[model samples]
Target chain A: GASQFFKDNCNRTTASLVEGVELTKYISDINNNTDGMYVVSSTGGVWRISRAKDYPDNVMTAEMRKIAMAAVLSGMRVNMCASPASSPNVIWAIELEAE
Target chain B: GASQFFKDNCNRTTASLVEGVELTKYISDINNNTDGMYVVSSTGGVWRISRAKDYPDNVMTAEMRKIAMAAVLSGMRVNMCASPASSPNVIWAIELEAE
Candidate 1:
């Protein structure tokens, strides 16, 4: 089952480059679009983790903000789906790492 | 823009646990759920990369099958949201890693 699978299989996941991001703002993005959140990595790379009407509503900008809140508190980096990235600037999804 | 942002920010992205997953199967699951896909990690851990009524319609099981096909052709691993993971066994989303 995935129980044992993830436990052992997840040991050496690779970098997708959505990591190392530091939360710069929550829903209070400088864009004020209520469409996305802003984050900046230590290297000074910035992006807008926006929530488009894409994917199921499993996670939304509202919820992303919640995760953003927790991330801010803990000073952790997030990984989002860069597939939706509009030229790498408006990539989407959460920074949560999974195996 | 995200173009400049991702180019620079993507350099130091760290790894999540979903990396290195070698796709073992596509829609050809041992379960035949018609709802999930099967994949195994190099460590012999197995999982069902199933799709659910979650997320926007941007990507679906049919499309996932396409991606799975391509991934299989390329011999690459995938990453899913895993948030929907019923027990990490059912963790969902593409094996794609994002920084």
Candidate 2:
């Protein structure tokens, strides 16, 4: 059972830009003990990361922000589903629990 | 007169996060009818919402995603200045008349 879920069709162009970044290093620094999942707009495109000894700062830069907003405006509106609780922005979890 | 419009620059540390919580108490308990406008980013920040029966669910969560994919990508790439008939994400409406 998974503890959280988010479903949305992210724009291909936008996904590529995010993936282009060297986020692996950042993820290693910020993620603590939380597990996360991300799926691209492509079929069978999925990426999972668990918060372990290091976690990347899930921070968005100005360039990233522009890309995200554009992507939002381009596609047929993506969906971001999460567990624990739904947030106005990204979903958050107060505690971990399998669904 | 105004109907709906959204400006960019949400990254006041993820514009979505800052204004996510106090979205007018779910925009005054699920906005019933509707009138909405939101602009964010320091220096002349703007956020407005209007509706009958205190409607709250504008329902545009997953619909808004990604940033690196918009016209604002470089600040040089920008276009489109008009009203009515825009789809995918934002600039949506059932009916309206404007000048």
Candidate 3:
């Protein structure tokens, strides 16, 4: 899904990696590697994974955790993927903060 | 619906058929008749009627079965083909994996 807020407020970049690798490679290497990451696919599927719980194995990273927390504070449901079984390693992770 | 892993991992083939034949016709008659089949249609909807279930009256040929299955699966959910209470023979069918 496209987010106008993200486009307006967050920095964006593009890169490619092999399937099955945790998205952290992009975050930890190039960007801030923040605790919250919001990744959207070209087909309109959005995945917000966090790093706080278990990092690479738990499906989310620290960046995703922040977004999940913000959503909770605002009374919105936090729908995150618990397993990679549905979509293997095809993901794009975003980094951002509250405005 | 496109899978790179599947293309790289599994055998590949190209064939065509009439709109309503049991994919089996293409498989058994043309190639290999496997128990499980995956068929996608362009602009058409998906359906799956089984041989074990009671077949509807007056319809013969696996083509009709495939057509009915497509109607059963694709009806009114995503795409719709509306009709009066009494019209016949207007539908398409696509098949997906059970899981």
Task: Tell me, by lDDT, which candidate is best.
Answer: 1
For residues B1-99, write the lDDT of model 1, one tens digit per residue: 123333344334441234445654222211112223444454555555455554564346546545554554455666543333354365434534224
Best by DockQ: 1
TM-score (C-alpha, index-matched) for candidate 2: 0.19
The TM-score between candidate 1 and the true structure equals 0.35
Q: Could you arrange the candidates by TM-score from highest to lowest?
A: 1, 2, 3
Q: Each model's C-alpha lDDT? A: 0.43, 0.21, 0.28
Candidate 1 — number of clashing residue pairs? Answer: 24
Mark the regions of model 3 whose C-alpha exceeds 4 Å error after superposition: A1-44, A48-60, A75-92, B1-99
Docking quality (DockQ) for each candidate: 0.04, 0.02, 0.01
Task: Report the lDDT tens digits of candidate 3 across residue range A14-91.
Answer: 422222211111110001121122333323233434333343644444345444323322333322223333343223
Q: Is candidate 2 or candidate 3 better by DockQ?
A: 2
Q: Which stretches of candidate 1 lie over 4 Å from their true place?
A: A1-16, A27-36, A53-55, A58-62, A83-88, A97-99, B1-88, B91-99
Q: What is the TM-score of each candidate against the true structure?
A: 0.35, 0.19, 0.18
Report the C-alpha lDDT of model 2 over B1-99, residue by residue, as the tens digit: 111111121111121212211111111122554334332223232333211231111112111111112212322121111122322113111111111
Cα lDDT of model 1 overall?
0.43
